[PDB]
Design a protein around this motif. Structure first.
Motif, short mmCIF file in Angstrom:
data_model
loop_
_atom_site.label_atom_id
_atom_site.label_comp_id
_atom_site.label_asym_id
_atom_site.label_seq_id
_atom_site.Cartn_x
_atom_site.Cartn_y
_atom_site.Cartn_z
N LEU A 10 0.88 -1.28 -0.03
CA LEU A 10 -0.01 -0.03 -0.17
C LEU A 10 0.87 1.21 -0.22
CD1 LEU A 10 -2.60 1.27 0.18
CD2 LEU A 10 -2.95 0.87 2.44
N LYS A 11 1.72 1.14 0.99
CA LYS A 11 2.69 2.25 1.15
C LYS A 11 3.82 2.54 -0.19
CE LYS A 11 4.02 2.01 5.32
NZ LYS A 11 4.33 1.60 6.68
N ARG A 12 3.94 1.40 -0.49
CA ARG A 12 4.93 1.28 -1.91
C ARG A 12 4.33 1.61 -3.00
NH1 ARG A 12 9.31 -0.44 -2.81
NH2 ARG A 12 9.97 -1.17 -4.77
N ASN A 13 2.82 1.26 -3.40
CA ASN A 13 2.32 1.88 -4.64
C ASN A 13 1.84 3.25 -4.40
OD1 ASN A 13 2.68 -0.51 -5.67
ND2 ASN A 13 0.51 -1.04 -5.68
N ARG A 14 1.58 3.94 -3.08
CA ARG A 14 1.26 5.09 -2.55
C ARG A 14 2.27 6.07 -2.77
NH1 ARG A 14 -2.87 5.29 2.07
NH2 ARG A 14 -4.59 4.09 1.11
N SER A 15 3.54 5.75 -2.54
CA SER A 15 4.83 6.82 -2.64
C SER A 15 5.59 6.66 -3.94
CB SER A 15 5.48 6.65 -1.48
OG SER A 15 4.78 6.65 -0.12
N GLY A 17 4.45 4.90 -6.91
CA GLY A 17 3.61 4.18 -7.90
C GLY A 17 3.46 5.21 -9.26
N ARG A 19 1.06 6.78 -10.78
CA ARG A 19 0.08 7.71 -10.47
C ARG A 19 0.62 8.79 -9.55
NH1 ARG A 19 -4.19 8.67 -9.04
NH2 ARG A 19 -5.53 9.86 -10.61
N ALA A 20 1.13 8.23 -8.44
CA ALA A 20 1.80 9.28 -7.62
C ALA A 20 3.24 9.63 -8.15
CB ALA A 20 2.17 8.65 -6.22
N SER A 45 4.28 0.08 -9.83
CA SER A 45 2.91 -0.58 -10.03
C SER A 45 2.63 -1.18 -11.52
CB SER A 45 1.80 1.03 -10.19
OG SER A 45 1.65 1.40 -8.83
#
Ligand SMILES: [Mg+2]
Ligand SMILES: [Mg+2]
Ligand SMILES: [Mg+2]
Ligand SMILES: [Mg+2]
Ligand SMILES: [Mg+2]
Ligand SMILES: [Mg+2]
Ligand SMILES: [Mg+2]
Ligand SMILES: [Mg+2]
Ligand SMILES: [Mg+2]
Ligand SMILES: [Mg+2]
Ligand SMILES: [Mg+2]
Ligand SMILES: [Mg+2]
Ligand SMILES: [Mg+2]
Ligand SMILES: [Mg+2]
Ligand SMILES: [Mg+2]
Ligand SMILES: [Mg+2]
Ligand SMILES: [Mg+2]
Ligand SMILES: [Mg+2]
Ligand SMILES: [Mg+2]
Ligand SMILES: [Mg+2]
Ligand SMILES: [Mg+2]
Ligand SMILES: [Mg+2]
Ligand SMILES: [Mg+2]
Ligand SMILES: [Mg+2]
Ligand SMILES: [Mg+2]
Ligand SMILES: [Mg+2]
Ligand SMILES: [Mg+2]
Ligand SMILES: [Mg+2]
Ligand SMILES: [Mg+2]
Ligand SMILES: [Mg+2]
Ligand SMILES: [Mg+2]
Ligand SMILES: [Mg+2]
Ligand SMILES: [Mg+2]
Ligand SMILES: [Mg+2]
Ligand SMILES: [Mg+2]
Ligand SMILES: [Mg+2]
Ligand SMILES: [Mg+2]
Ligand SMILES: [Mg+2]
Ligand SMILES: [Mg+2]
Ligand SMILES: [Mg+2]
Ligand SMILES: [Mg+2]
Ligand SMILES: [Mg+2]
Ligand SMILES: [Mg+2]
Ligand SMILES: [Mg+2]
Ligand SMILES: [Mg+2]
Ligand SMILES: [Mg+2]
Ligand SMILES: [Mg+2]
Ligand SMILES: [Mg+2]
Ligand SMILES: [Mg+2]
Ligand SMILES: [Mg+2]
Ligand SMILES: [Mg+2]
Ligand SMILES: [Mg+2]
Ligand SMILES: [Mg+2]
Ligand SMILES: [Mg+2]
Ligand SMILES: [Mg+2]
Ligand SMILES: [Mg+2]
Ligand SMILES: [Mg+2]
Ligand SMILES: [Mg+2]
Ligand SMILES: [Mg+2]
Ligand SMILES: [Mg+2]
Ligand SMILES: [Mg+2]
Ligand SMILES: [Mg+2]
Ligand SMILES: [Mg+2]
Ligand SMILES: [Mg+2]
Ligand SMILES: [Mg+2]
Ligand SMILES: [Mg+2]
Ligand SMILES: [Mg+2]
Ligand SMILES: [Mg+2]
Ligand SMILES: [Mg+2]
Ligand SMILES: [Mg+2]
Ligand SMILES: [Mg+2]
Ligand SMILES: [Mg+2]
Lengths: 45, 94, 271, 23
Positions: A10-15, A17, A19-20, A45
Motif C-alpha cells: 500500500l505504501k509502496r504503490n502510494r509513494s 507508484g 500515479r503518485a 505499479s
RNA sequence: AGGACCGAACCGACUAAUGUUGAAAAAUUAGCGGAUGACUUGUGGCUGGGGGUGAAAGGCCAAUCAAACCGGGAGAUAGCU
RNA sequence: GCUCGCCGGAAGACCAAGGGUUCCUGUCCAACGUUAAUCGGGGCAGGGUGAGUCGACCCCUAAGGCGAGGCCGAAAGGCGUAGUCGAUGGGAAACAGGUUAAUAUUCCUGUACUUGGUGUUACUGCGAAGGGGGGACGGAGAAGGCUAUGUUGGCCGGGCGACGGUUGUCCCGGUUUAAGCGUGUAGGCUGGUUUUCCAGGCAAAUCCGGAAAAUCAAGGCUGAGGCGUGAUGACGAGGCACUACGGUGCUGAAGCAACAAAUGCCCUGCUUCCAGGAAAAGCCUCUAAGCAUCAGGUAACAUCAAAUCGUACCCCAAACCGACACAGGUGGUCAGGUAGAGAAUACCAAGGCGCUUGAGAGAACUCGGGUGAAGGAACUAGGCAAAAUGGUGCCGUAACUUCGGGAGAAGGCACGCUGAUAUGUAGGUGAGGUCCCUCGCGGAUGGAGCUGAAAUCAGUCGAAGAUACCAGCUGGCUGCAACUGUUUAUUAAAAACACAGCACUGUGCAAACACGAAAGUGGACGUAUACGGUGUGACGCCUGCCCGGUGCCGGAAGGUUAAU
C-alpha cells in the motif's frame, strides 16, 4: 535486529507508484527520464 | 439477451483431470476451461445454449499460471479461467 | 475548593485539586458538541510553528453562546458543566421557548437563576446588556470590542474588567491586565466575575498532569548546542551572552508591539 | 542443463577504526 | 487510590563471560530496570536538507549526518603523493 | 515399524502483512543442500484454490490527500471552498457433519437467514441535497449471573493382567451435537398514557424541544445464559468383511448428573475519578417542494437475482525483513492435565520435532558447568565474578521523617505424611419434598448428594519437610540529583535532559511569536487565572551590596545627522 525495509505494498504503490509519480511536476520528468533511458518497468505499479 | 457470437466465443475447452472426471460422475458437473473475461451468467447461458442441457449453477475460479524456465530465460504461462458447471438432477451431458 | 492530596506517593505529595460537586457528573448536550482535532502545533506547511504543544486527552469543542443573540427571552440555567477547552465552567441554559445554549459561567450562578440578555434586562450577574446602559463604575465580563462579534475581553476563569468612564460614545475599560482601553459603547457585556476563580489555586503536582493538559517538555536554551539555539554550547555551564529568543530577539524586557492601527485605543499602558 | 551459478564477488561493505590508537 | 509495591507478557539495555574474519556489519547466555503510564504497539497520514525532528547527545533523517542520497556544473581544484 | 529425547502461553493450531506456485503426485540427481542422498522448500511434466452469508469491491466518514471556481505567486506553482477520495473504525445475512494426494463457513447432505427488484391481493398521504432521534464512543475498579472448558460419579463397551497381588471401593475408552426459530430469565435503563398551546430546531410540522391540564404507578426498551426445537437425524468405541495391504463399504450401544470456573459474554452495563473522553452513513420519524388517488408507501404472497476479485502453501519462518536453507526481527486469534497465587516454573496430553556433517580418542589449552580440606576479601583499580539470602502464616521493628513513610527494617518461630476433632470440618452449591403461588426460567423452610479449605492434639519417617524448578543479600556514614521518567540506535544512561513549583519579561486579540516573498495557517476555534520566550529546578530556611561597563526600557530640550 529490525531491518530498514518493512515491505507494505500500500505504501509502496502510494509513494512510488505510477500515479503518485504522475501527479507532481518533477515526477513527470522522472517518468520521462526512464522512457528515454528505455527501462523495463517504469515504476513499481 | 446475450450476444450469440459472445456465447460462441466464451467456451474454449473442457478440462481433463482426475478431479474433473470424479466431479463429472459423482455430482454431474462438467468442468470447462473458459475465456479470461467471462462471467457466471454468460457461462450459464452459453452452456445452456451450445450443448442444449439444463444447468443449475456455475462455479468459477481463476487459475494462476506458473512461471517456467524454458532454456535459460524465465517466462510466464498465461492465466485463464476454470468453471465447474453443474447440471440438473438426472441429466447426462458428455 | 482546594484539597491537598495526602502524600501516599511521591508525585502525589504536592498535588492540590479543585473539587466542586456542582460540576454536573454525566453527559454533555449532544446538539452542541463538535469535533476538535488536536493540532500538534503544526500549520498547513507542516512545520512546528509554536512549540510545546502535542499530546494529551481528547477533547470535544463545545459550542458556546459568546454572542448572546437571543434577546428578550428569560433563560433559566439548567445545569453547570465542566468545559475542558477554556478555563471557566459553562452553564447549559434553557430558554423560555425551549432552545438550550451554553453560556460562560459567572461567579454566583447556580441551577435556578434567570439570565436575561438584551437591552431591557435588569442588572444582576449574567444579564447581558450593552454598555450604553451599564451603570458606570461596574464590573463586567465577556465584553465585545466590535459590536456584534462575540465576547473577547475577560472570559478566563475568574477575570473581569471595570468600566471606569463613559464620554462621547466610547466606554473606557480598565482591563484585567491593568491597561485602560477605549471600546465603542454599543458593545454588549455580561455582568459579574467569571466562575472558576480557584483555577489559579490548583497546582499540577506532577509532570504527567502537564502532559495530560497537552504540553510537551520545554528544553531551555543554555543546555543546547549553538546550532540549535543562541545560548548553546560552552564547556561547563556558560551563559555569557544576552538573553534572546531562539530566533535572535531579546526576551528580558524588550517591547514588541507592532500594530499601529489600534494605537488609538490605548488610553494607558499596563503597569 | 547448464546453470553456471557463478555471480561476481561484491564483498566489501564498509569498515571502522575501533582500535586502541597510539596518540 | 496512585507517573505506589514484588513480578511473567511486552518494552528495554546496567554488569559479566562468550564472540570478535562471529551463528549476528551490535548478538547469545546468566543476572538487571520499568511493567495502569511522561507506557507500549499495529495500520494509514505529516514535516525535506542550512531543512526537518529533537524530555538536547550535535543525536536521528533507509547498516552513512558539525549538514543525507542520486544526477549535473565536472576531467572542480591540489605549490601535495 | 519399535524404542529414546525435546517444546508443550510453543519448537502446537488458525490468520493478517509479506512472498508468489514453495502446495500434491510422478520422474531424474548434472548444478543447489556447508558432506553422502534413492531425499528436498532443487530440475522437469502433470495436477490443484469452486463463496448470496468469510474477506476485499461497495455505502459512510477520521488524520489527511487532490481540490471546478477563487485568493496568492517572476514562471513553475502554494493555499483552500464546493466537492471527491482516504480504514486501522461504523454498515444486511450460515452453522453443523462428511469427502480430496491437493480446496473447503466456498464442494456434497441437513437445516437455515439477509437485501433488492418484478408481478399478484388487500389498505392509504407518499416524498428531501432538510429538521430531529439514534448510530455515538474515556481510564480504573467491584460485584452478581453465566458460558467456554475441565474434574468426579453414573451409564455403555472392552480387560482379568509376560513379575508378588488384582471380581473390584479395580483398569481402559467413549459419554458429541450447532446455526436458526420460539419462550424474554439473571439483570440494567426509562415514569407512562392522553389533550391544548408555544418568542425555538434557516421555512415546514403530528417529529424534537418547551410549558399547562386529566388518568394509571406499570407500560416499554435492552439483555448473557438456560429449556424446548433443529435431532427420529448426524457423530460415535467398535464389529462384519472383498482384496492391489494402501484401503474401502454396511451396521453401530451409552450418549446423563454433580462440582469447579475463566481475562470470554451480560458489559456499548453499574460504582467512581478528572486528565472530560471520533465523525458521517446505514436505521426510525416529521414535513416543504410537488405528485393528486396517478404515482408512491406497508402487511403479506409467489417469482428472479446476488455480479467481479482473493481463497493453494509458509505465515515467530528453511518460503516475509536481514547477501545465506543465517542461534536476530515481526501484529492478532485458540490457551488442556498435575502441583502453583500465576499466562512464572517442573513434568505432560493432543500435536510437532531431534536443530543437513559423522566415527573415534578422553593431551595441553579455551568455553559452559559441578564439588572442595583449612582460612575467609588476604584477590583487586574496585567483593568484578561467583557463593549465599529466597516462600506462606505469625511474633517484632530503630535512628530519622515532608506524618505517608523508614519497613519485607533488622531478627526469629511453625511448615512432610498419617489418625482424631470431622469415616470431608467451616464455608460454597442445592436435588428432592412441603406450602403458597400475581402459575412460571416464580418465592420461602428444606438440606440429600457434590465439593472443600484452614487450624489444634497425637503418632511416625528422614541427616535435611518452602525438601527439586521458581524464589530480597542485609546494615552504618556520606557526596550528587527531590522523586517516576528521557538520551549519545551500534564504546558514555549519569551528577546530563525533562519535571511540578518559582520569578522576570513580551502580548489588549486582525495578539506577541513562528512557517511561508504572498495568500494563509499554527497560536486558538483560546482572550491576561490565557499564550509565547527566558533562567531556575520539589519542600523548609532564605535571595545581601553595585547602574561604573555591555544590554534593555522612559525623555526629545540641545550637538552631530540621509533621501528630498
Ligand atoms: Mg526497481
Ligand atoms: Mg469466487
Ligand atoms: Mg514553552
Ligand atoms: Mg518551564
Ligand atoms: Mg527544562
Ligand atoms: Mg550539550
Ligand atoms: Mg548563532
Ligand atoms: Mg566554568
Ligand atoms: Mg566571566
Ligand atoms: Mg509501578
Ligand atoms: Mg537477556
Ligand atoms: Mg515491577
Ligand atoms: Mg544541504
Ligand atoms: Mg559536543
Ligand atoms: Mg543511519
Ligand atoms: Mg555545506
Ligand atoms: Mg582529477
Ligand atoms: Mg568549471
Ligand atoms: Mg519435557
Ligand atoms: Mg506455527
Ligand atoms: Mg520452482
Ligand atoms: Mg511436500
Ligand atoms: Mg516428489
Ligand atoms: Mg553421485
Ligand atoms: Mg551434494
Ligand atoms: Mg520442487
Ligand atoms: Mg460478512
Ligand atoms: Mg466515500
Ligand atoms: Mg477533505
Ligand atoms: Mg489544495
Ligand atoms: Mg482554475
Ligand atoms: Mg477496517
Ligand atoms: Mg468494516
Ligand atoms: Mg492444505
Ligand atoms: Mg454452492
Ligand atoms: Mg440524523
Ligand atoms: Mg472503560
Ligand atoms: Mg458447563
Ligand atoms: Mg471415569
Ligand atoms: Mg501381571
Ligand atoms: Mg501374575
Ligand atoms: Mg439455537
Ligand atoms: Mg489459505
Ligand atoms: Mg539448517
Ligand atoms: Mg532464522
Ligand atoms: Mg498450563
Ligand atoms: Mg514456560
Ligand atoms: Mg574435556
Ligand atoms: Mg561452585
Ligand atoms: Mg575451600
Ligand atoms: Mg564433604
Ligand atoms: Mg569447610
Ligand atoms: Mg578493607
Ligand atoms: Mg587488598
Ligand atoms: Mg595486593
Ligand atoms: Mg554481582
Ligand atoms: Mg549465584
Ligand atoms: Mg567527597
Ligand atoms: Mg534523578
Ligand atoms: Mg529512573
Ligand atoms: Mg525515547
Ligand atoms: Mg550507546
Ligand atoms: Mg533507547
Ligand atoms: Mg551502555
Ligand atoms: Mg489565525
Ligand atoms: Mg539546572
Ligand atoms: Mg541545582
Ligand atoms: Mg542576586
Ligand atoms: Mg547599565
Ligand atoms: Mg547610568
Ligand atoms: Mg540597583
Ligand atoms: Mg532609547
Amino acid at each position: 535486529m529490525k531491518r530498514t525495509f518493512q515491505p507494505s505494498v500500500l505504501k509502496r504503490n502510494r509513494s512510488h507508484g505510477f500515479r503518485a509519480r504522475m501527479a507532481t511536476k518533477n515526477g513527470r520528468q522522472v517518468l520521462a527520464r526512464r522512457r528515454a533511458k528505455g527501462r523495463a518497468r517504469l515504476t513499481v505499479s | 439477451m446475450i450476444r450469440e457470437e459472445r456465447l460462441l466465443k466464451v467456451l474454449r475447452a473442457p478440462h481433463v483431470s482426475e478431479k474433473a472426471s470424479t466431479a463429472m460422475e459423482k455430482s454431474n458437473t462438467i468442468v470447462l476451461k473458459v475465456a479470461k473475461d467471462a462471467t457466471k451468467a454468460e457461462i450459464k447461458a452459453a452452456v445452456q445454449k451450445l450443448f442444449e442441457v439444463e444447468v443449475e449453477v456455475v462455479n468459477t475460479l481463476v487459475v494462476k499460471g506458473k512461471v517456467k524456465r524454458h532454456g535459460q530465460r524465465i517466462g510466464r504461462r498465461s492465466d485463464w479461467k476454470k468453471a465447474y458447471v453443474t447440471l440438473k438432477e438426472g441429466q447426462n451431458l458428455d | 475548593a482546594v484539597v491537598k492530596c495526602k502524600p501516599t506517593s511521591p508525585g502525589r505529595r504536592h498535588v492540590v485539586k479543585v473539587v466542586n460537586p456542582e460540576l454536573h457528573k454525566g453527559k454533555p448536550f449532544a446538539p452542541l458538541l463538535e469535533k476538535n482535532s488536536k493540532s500538534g502545533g503544526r500549520n498547513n506547511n507542516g512545520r512546528i510553528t509554536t512549540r510545546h504543544i502535542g499530546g494529551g486527552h481528547k477533547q470535544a469543542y463545545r459550542i458556546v453562546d459568546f454572542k448572546r443573540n437571543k434577546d428578550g427571552i428569560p433563560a433559566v440555567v439548567e445545569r453547570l458543566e465542566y468545559d475542558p477547552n477554556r478555563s471557566a465552567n459553562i452553564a447549559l441554559v434553557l430558554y423560555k421557548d425551549g432552545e438550550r445554549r451554553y453560556i460562560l459561567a459567572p461567579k454566583g450562578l447556580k441551577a435556578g437563576d434567570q439570565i436575561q440578555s438584551g437591552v431591557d434586562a435588569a442588572i444582576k450577574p449574567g444579564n447581558t446588556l450593552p454598555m450604553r446602559n451599564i451603570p458606570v463604575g461596574s464590573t463586567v465580563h465577556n465584553v465585545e470590542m466590535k459590536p456584534g462579534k462575540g465576547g473577547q475581553l475577560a472570559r478566563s476563569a475568574g477575570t473581569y474588567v471595570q468600566i471606569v468612564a463613559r464620554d462621547g460614545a466610547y466606554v473606557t475599560l480598565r482591563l484585567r491586565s491593568g491597561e485602560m482601553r477605549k471600546v465603542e459603547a454599543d458593545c454588549r457585556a455580561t455582568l459579574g466575575e467569571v466562575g472558576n476563580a480557584e483555577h489559579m489555586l490548583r497546582v499540577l503536582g506532577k509532570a504527567g498532569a502537564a502532559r495530560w493538559r497537552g504540553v510537551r517538555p520545554t528544553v531551555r536554551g543554555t543546555a543546547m548546542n549553538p546550532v540549535d539555539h543562541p545560548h548553546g554550547g560552552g564547556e561547563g555551564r556558560n551563559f555569557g551572552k544576552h538573553p534572546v529568543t531562539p530566533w535572535g530577539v531579546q526576551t528580558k524586557g524588550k517591547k514588541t508591539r507592532s500594530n499601529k492601527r489600534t494605537d488609538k485605543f490605548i488610553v494607558r499602558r499596563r503597569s | 542443463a547448464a546453470a553456471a551459478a557463478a555471480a561476481a564477488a561484491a564483498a566489501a561493505a564498509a569498515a571502522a577504526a575501533a582500535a586502541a590508537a597510539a596518540a
